[PDB]
Write an enzyme that holds these catalytic residues in place. Structure first.
Site, short mmCIF file in Angstrom:
data_model
loop_
_atom_site.label_atom_id
_atom_site.label_comp_id
_atom_site.label_asym_id
_atom_site.label_seq_id
_atom_site.Cartn_x
_atom_site.Cartn_y
_atom_site.Cartn_z
N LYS A 1 -1.55 16.19 -44.54
CA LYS A 1 -0.29 16.86 -44.85
C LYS A 1 0.56 16.04 -45.82
CE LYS A 1 3.58 19.37 -43.75
NZ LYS A 1 3.73 20.58 -44.58
N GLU B 1 -5.53 5.66 -43.52
CA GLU B 1 -6.99 5.66 -43.48
C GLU B 1 -7.56 6.68 -44.45
OE1 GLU B 1 -6.68 5.01 -38.81
OE2 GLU B 1 -8.74 4.95 -39.57
N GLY C 1 -1.77 18.68 -35.75
CA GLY C 1 -3.13 18.32 -36.16
C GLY C 1 -4.20 18.83 -35.21
N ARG C 2 -3.99 18.67 -33.91
CA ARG C 2 -4.99 19.09 -32.93
C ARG C 2 -5.00 20.60 -32.69
NH1 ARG C 2 -0.92 15.87 -30.83
NH2 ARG C 2 0.47 17.00 -29.39
N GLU D 1 -4.24 14.21 -26.19
CA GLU D 1 -3.12 13.90 -27.07
C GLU D 1 -1.93 14.81 -26.79
OE1 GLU D 1 -3.29 14.27 -31.52
OE2 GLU D 1 -3.24 12.08 -31.48
N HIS E 1 -29.05 14.84 -17.50
CA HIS E 1 -29.94 13.69 -17.47
C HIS E 1 -29.23 12.40 -17.79
CE1 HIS E 1 -33.03 16.67 -17.11
NE2 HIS E 1 -32.68 17.23 -18.25
N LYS F 1 -0.12 1.80 -35.08
CA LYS F 1 -0.08 1.84 -36.54
C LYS F 1 0.82 0.74 -37.10
CE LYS F 1 -1.14 6.76 -36.90
NZ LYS F 1 -0.63 8.09 -37.35
#
Ligand SMILES: [Cl-]
Ligand SMILES: [Cl-]
Ligand SMILES: [Cl-]
Ligand SMILES: [Cl-]
Ligand code: NA
Ligand code: NA
Ligand code: NA
Ligand code: NA
Ligand code: NA
Ligand code: NA
Ligand code: NA
Ligand code: NA
Lengths: 557, 557
Positions: free
Chosen positions: A220, A226, A281-282, A367, A398, A520
């Site tokens: 955005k 990153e 974001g999520r 989050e 398994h 951060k």
């Protein structure tokens, strides 16, 4: 602008919560599932629900009857939802009210998939036209790329898409393109770069041709640390081949609204696909962030994905609480978390294409609801979001179902399957076997195996405890027809509104994420120290010792 | 044959356990990490440990000092290990005693990586020569395949390896080949097929040529249900092109000891790579099951992988408990699980190649210790194995670290990084940033951010609680030099012996898995019902309703 005081402060102060505690103490904690099924042949009818997907004209069955529920339990949980104002907060969210109270923002992912163009507004300005404008732009662009009309700087068709972004700019695109792979373009290769660890971009670029690779830079602000570094590394690689910075505009587009940073990067402003501040974001795969999905499966399938979520939105908005599917899912999570002490929530899709569905839900859930401050600013007096985890089955069986069946934790579990496979190998044998495990795992967890059954089968008497299954381990089973784009959209929206219901009952903000900022800030400080000879001692002794060890091992002054 | 009574019954009956409870009540529960660091500048020295990897001549730093530990806590946990006989059980395992007491089997994955050929025996017969014979066979075969000497039925070099297996026959090969990808053959493509869901084998075969694809069928019995079906589907696809069943022998090998079923399948008995009954699936990547690893990275790198584990085995076997690294890791897990009530354990590698490391550890840990019956046959009076989960960082940070920093759960956390990258993109900038997050996340979780710091930075007074970080959230930091084959081997062995220590203290069997059998039995029954018109009603009402819904949606009588 400003609104009302919250309806309540602590969930524990609501009368229905206190009734649920008394119900737990007297009855809920003594529920033995196999006894309730023995005594109530109508239990499956009472506690199952059916959702009609009008997009692909199928039905999804949600069976909650293997949960710690009686009719009385359900009545009290619905009462708690009403006392917590779940419907009121929901209606506020759909009205565009700023229910994200710590950021003074609307919460309007539901507008992204408003495929019927119902009136939707934030701050008394409709958002529908802007949402639709971006979608039309996405449509045009994806048609151009998929048809070959959009050509690289040497005139070739684009065959590699590389999405660069973190968190919600990555997990949804990954999980949805994996889940809907049967709908994906046969000639298209997708890479999803997200980690700052240089291994991620390196492996993506190693097997890509700058002449046929298109980059989607998802951020955005277009100043995410990153993502900016990965994006710069991608550009450097590109120019090492294309040389002229003018060619950037044919190979980089932006899922962003920072037109200054985007053009400064070299992207034509005509190739930004924006998404609003009220898209978390999520909760963003429905927005411009889904462009890699639309590229891969085509815009019409992406729109069907939107429309399935919209059908679930309608169910959530219009259904009385007693029959409301995401609401019941959320209330069960509160029940298990706060009255049975369950710290976790398993989601296991019996579906290999959905292998990244648990990791997506893990961000959505944790989050959103990994929070401890109420709307009134108090520290919660009860636990909030679980650790959500899982793997696809049968792989999960398994790996760790041993602990599910015989460990010492209560693990509320969701099992998800489609009745039909996109890959019905060997006359449906693989799919009948997959189905047999979906059905048997929830059965096994419910009924267990008594010491008497064990001994009847010939076990050594002194191995009987080791082979006993206590059972009474609850599950929710979700049976879809087929994982189409719309059915997947409806399934995600189920979990979005489940997550909404949890946070509404807990009285927390499901839509902020202040908890990411300390890491951060401290990382940027440490990064400058790593870049500075002799610096790094202004920390506690552990962080200082690790930083020094790192400088020594990595050859930094 | 038969041996001694166990040393104890319930961990709660040991005097050191009772002392730990009193220690928790009076002190442990009041530990505030930032206060202990303020008062003890030597805390990092006291509670960090260094492991020398003699294979790649590096050191791995294990920092436990950000855990809820004082010198007294450590003394009591080591005392508990001694009262629980951790060293005695360990020595029994290395002697080849049948410590897997419910199956009367040795537990001898340590013999697989006995690279110094120290004397090792089960049932008074040395195993060293047999272990070495298989390894030599693996070496020869991988040399043949990698060199191109081994040719397909049309004389082409093999370029695709497809491993078919479930659980421990899949997760290790996947995770290790992903983790060691920089060492992998540039021309080789690997597919790992494990799910019975036909989508898995279909996508693997879609992009493979029978003429250049080699199949590894991984199953000790060669009668594992899911693996047998996938293996049969692979063969059908192969023959549709190769037609002559004689060509099978050039394209299928077996990681198995059932020579009758293997040859019946069409595999030459000379191409079975065996592994012993005393190799547990979740401890098997060191055995013939690692053949896909040796194929990909070469046998010499596989042997280095073995040798790193062997160096960790030696550390575990020879180090006094106070300085014993896996033992301290295991004791911390008991401390958090049984005295602080933590139901989970996070492992987050700051390393994208290690992206499947948490899923591997999840089987190792949860299938080992998801148990509730002691050696004496009693039901435990304390919780056992946690839910182990994680994702690589920094991805994990953007997914769920919000909950880690501000949620309402205690989540013991392991952070793992290499000081050097195999892909030092952009002059090490990506790696310095990765490192800054590794260091800052544990710092942030420890020190938090007080309301006073928050207000100092200008936050609205009524947002202060939302931006506060309580801190005091423990972590373990593991800093390696570089993820080489031997360093990875040592890291896995760390977690194997951590898992050993947990189960020894809990007095459970870390090496059986009786808890998987009920699901298998009930699934086979349901599978026959799905194949039988009119059948499926002999279940509880939920399982019956789901089975009927499935039959209707899938068009079964
Ligand atoms: Cl009832
Ligand atoms: Cl709490
Ligand atoms: Cl101390
Ligand atoms: Cl227990
Ligand atoms: Na357990
Ligand atoms: Na069970
Ligand atoms: Na026996
Ligand atoms: Na659809
Ligand atoms: Na939480
Ligand atoms: Na923190
Ligand atoms: Na403000
Ligand atoms: Na090595």
């Amino acid at each position: 602008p400003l609104g009302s005081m919250p309806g309540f402060s602590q969930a524990t102060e609501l009368g229905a919560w206190k009734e649920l505690q008394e119900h737990h103490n007297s009855l809920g904690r003594n529920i033995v599932l196999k006894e309730y099924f023995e005594k109530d042949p109508q239990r499956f009818e009472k506690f199952s629900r059916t959702f009609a997907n009008p997009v692909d004209n199928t039905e999804i069955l949600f069976d909650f009857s293997k949960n710690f529920l009686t009719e009385e339990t359900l009545a009290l949980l619905v009462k708690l939802a009403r006392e917590a104002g779940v419907e009121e907060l929901r209606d506020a969210m759909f009205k565009g009210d700023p229910i994200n109270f710590t950021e003074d923002r609307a919460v309007y992912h539901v507008a992204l998939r408003n495929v019927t163009n119902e009136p939707m507004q934030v701050n008394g300005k409709s958002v529908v036209e802007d949402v639709n404008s971006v979608l039309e732009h996405m449509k045009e662009f994806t048609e151009q790329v998929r048809s070959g009309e959009w050509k690289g700087y040497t005139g070739k068709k684009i065959t590699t898409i590389i999405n660069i972004g973190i968190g919600g700019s990555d997990l949804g695109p990954v999980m949805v393109t994996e889940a809907l792979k049967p709908y994906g373009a046969e000639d298209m290769t997708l890479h999803f770069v997200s980690n700052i660890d240089g291994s991620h971009i390196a492996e993506a670029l190693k097997h890509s041709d700058p002449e046929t690779t298109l980059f989607l830079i998802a951020s955005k602000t277009f100043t995410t640390a990153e993502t900016t570094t990965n994006a710069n590394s991608a550009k450097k690689w590109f120019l090492e081949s294309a040389k002229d910075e003018a060619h950037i505009a044919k190979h980089f587009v932006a899922l962003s609204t920072n037109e200054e940073e985007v053009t400064k990067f070299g992207i034509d402003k005509k190739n930004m696909f924006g998404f609003a501040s009220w898209v978390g974001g999520r909760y963003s795969v429905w927005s411009a962030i889904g462009l890699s999905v639309a590229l891969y499966i085509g815009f019409d399938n992406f729109h069907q994905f939107l429309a399935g979520a919209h059908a679930m939105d309608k169910h959530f908005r219009e259904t009385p609480l007693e029959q409301n599917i995401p609401v019941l899912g959320g209330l069960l999570s509160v029940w298990y978390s706060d009255f049975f002490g369950a710290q976790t929530h398993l989601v296991a899709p019996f579906d290999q294409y959905l292998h990244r569905f648990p990791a997506y839900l893990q961000q959505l859930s944790m989050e959103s609801n990994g929070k401890a401050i109420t709307r009134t600013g108090e520290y919660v007096k009860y636990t909030t979001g679980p650790i959500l985890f899982g793997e696809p089955a049968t792989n999960a069986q398994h790996s760790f179902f041993q602990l599910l069946h015989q460990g010492t934790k209560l693990i509320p579990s969701d099992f998800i399957m489609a009745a039909e496979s996109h890959n019905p190998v060997e006359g449906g044998k693989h799919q009948r076997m997959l189905a047999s495990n979906f059905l048997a795992q929830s059965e096994a967890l419910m009924v267990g195996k008594t010491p008497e059954q064990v001994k009847t089968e010939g076990a050594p008497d002194n191995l009987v405890p080791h082979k006993t299954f206590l059972g009474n381990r609850p599950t929710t089973s979700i049976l879809a027809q087929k994982i189409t784009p719309s059915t997947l959209g409806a399934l995600i929206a189920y979990y979005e509104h489940l997550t909404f219901t949890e946070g509404a009952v807990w009285n927390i903000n499901s839509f902020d994420q202040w908890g990411v900022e300390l890491g951060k800030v401290l990382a940027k400080k440490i990064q400058k120290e790593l870049e500075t000879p002799g610096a790094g001692g202004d920390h506690d002794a552990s962080t200082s010792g690790l930083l020094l060890a790192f400088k020594k091992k990595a050859n930094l002054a």
